[PDB]
């Protein structure tokens, strides 16, 4: 086929939408652009003019993803490490060699991932609902059938204080007993030499 599945996502409001393109002359300006490259929407006169877009990724005709730093218009193979994009590991330290499409944009693409950073005054079909709420104590403190709520974390109740105090006391008494044992052993051996590391300070 000869098209491009342009997917648009709005991060300020959490809304995304998709559409189709049936030409290249229109996208010639899009050609030769890399990721994180500003692309004005005036190319699309259908309520996208004057809006600044950012290219974030896409999939070539065969489906191979796009990698940032290759700097190429065709796909290539490299040895992918752990934690890298476009690779799911199975063993802890395993690698894999697989193909990926180049970062530079070209006609061979079939899907384009773009984001909106700055637009004009006109509003477009493309509020952010929050399916979850902060769970850490610091987060919530900064910010403000059945009843289901998240369990709070990082809260220091009574028993945490008792545990910490007990641990501190245990360590202190351990050190005190060791000091006493060293003192009594040193008091002994009055008739022999000794060689231990003297505590400094």
């Amino acid at each position: 086929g000869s098209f491009c599945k342009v997917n648009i996502s709005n991060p300020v409001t959490g809304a995304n939408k998709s559409l189709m393109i049936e030409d290249f002359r229109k996208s010639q300006t899009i050609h030769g652009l890399r990721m994180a490259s500003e692309f004005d929407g005036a190319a699309l006169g259908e309520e996208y003019a004057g809006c600044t877009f950012r290219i974030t990724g896409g999939n070539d005709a065969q489906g191979f993803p796009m990698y940032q730093g290759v700097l190429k218009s065709q796909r290539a193979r490299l040895l992918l490490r752990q934690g890298a994009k476009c690779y799911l590991h199975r063993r802890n330290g395993e690698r894999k060699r697989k193909s990926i499409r180049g970062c530079i944009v070209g006609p061979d693409l079939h899907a384009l991932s773009v984001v909106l950073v700055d637009a004009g005054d006109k509003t477009l079909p493309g509020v952010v609902p929050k399916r979850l709420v902060p769970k850490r104590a610091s987060k919530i403190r900064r910010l403000f059938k059945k009843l289901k709520y998240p369990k709070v974390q990082r809260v220091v109740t009574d028993e945490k204080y008792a545990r910490k105090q007990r641990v501190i006391a245990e360590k202190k008494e351990i050190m005190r007993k060791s000091l006493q044992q060293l003192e009594e052993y040193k008091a002994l051996l009055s008739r022999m030499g000794k060689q231990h590391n003297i505590r400094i300070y």
């Binding site: 044992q181 060293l182 052993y185 060689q195 590391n197």
Partner: protein
């Protein structure tokens, strides 16, 4: 050449004094690391299943151990493969049975029931005196127990009495001629005798000669000579006072029991 440590144990390759049956199964329990090594120990399950007969299978022994019904030196142990060794304390409070693990004349592990007056301690053999971190003197024992700041008068191959409740020394027995000993390895395991000579060969093993009370004399190397008190034993010993009978006498005993 195996790439790592071994975890299994074939039944035929197991120690002889365990007395495992040839056709019981392909495998045998593999004791885990602990106070005693593989060749001078015995797994707990063997005692709990093939000796006292309190359990008929692995699962029963595991359940019993999880319920914490067995104490080893006052500390409950939940491992079915925990290694038990010489001069241990084996008390089961729920049935008021307390035993001490020792060697019989035939050279096998045995349980000697004991009293409460002497069940709160154990005897340990000191094998090493070394300086640890900061130059602090230390000592180690045959049961993998390290003590700090010991008395200078204690030397190697001595015997130490440590209280189980706390783990502190109370008295020690010097290694010398005329002290009752017990043999813990070799062809003479389980015998009791008194040291008569100590012959040291430079750069090689030291040989110890002891005489049995009846008058018999035998030799063994110092690596498996265990002092168990002065003149008289400090702890209880099996009914026979470490006297190994001859084949003819043993056959007479067998016929009498038949």
């Amino acid at each position: 050449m195996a790439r790592g440590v071994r975890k299994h144990l074939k039944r035929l390759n197991a120690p002889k004094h365990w007395l495992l049956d040839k056709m019981g199964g392909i495998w045998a329990p593999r004791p885990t690391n602990g106070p005693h090594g593989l060749r001078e120990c015995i797994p707990l399950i063997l005692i709990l299943r093939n000796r006292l007969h309190y359990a008929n299978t692995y699962a029963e022994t595991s359940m019993i151990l999880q319920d914490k019904n067995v104490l080893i030196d006052g500390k409950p142990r939940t491992d079915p493969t925990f290694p038990v060794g010489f001069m241990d304390v084996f008390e089961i409070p729920k049935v008021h049975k307390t035993f001490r693990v020792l060697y019989d004349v035939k050279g096998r592990f045995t349980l000697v029931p004991i009293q409460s007056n002497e069940a709160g301690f154990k005897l340990c053999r000191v094998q090493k005196i070394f300086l640890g971190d900061k130059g602090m003197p230390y000592l180690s024992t045959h049961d993998a127990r390290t003590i700090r700041f010991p008395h200078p008068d204690i030397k190697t191959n001595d015997t130490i009495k440590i209280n189980l409740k706390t783990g502190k020394i109370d008295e020690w027995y010097k290694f010398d001629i005329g002290k009752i000993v017990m043999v813990t390895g070799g062809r003479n395991c389980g015998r009791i005798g008194t040291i008569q000579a100590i012959d040291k060969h430079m750069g090689s093993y030291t040989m110890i000669r002891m005489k049995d009370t009846e008058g018999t004399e035998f030799l063994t190397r110092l690596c498996n000579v265990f002092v168990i008190g002065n003149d008289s034993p400090a702890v209880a010993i099996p009914t026979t006072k470490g006297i190994r009978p001859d084949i003819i006498k043993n056959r007479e005993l067998r016929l009498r029991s038949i």
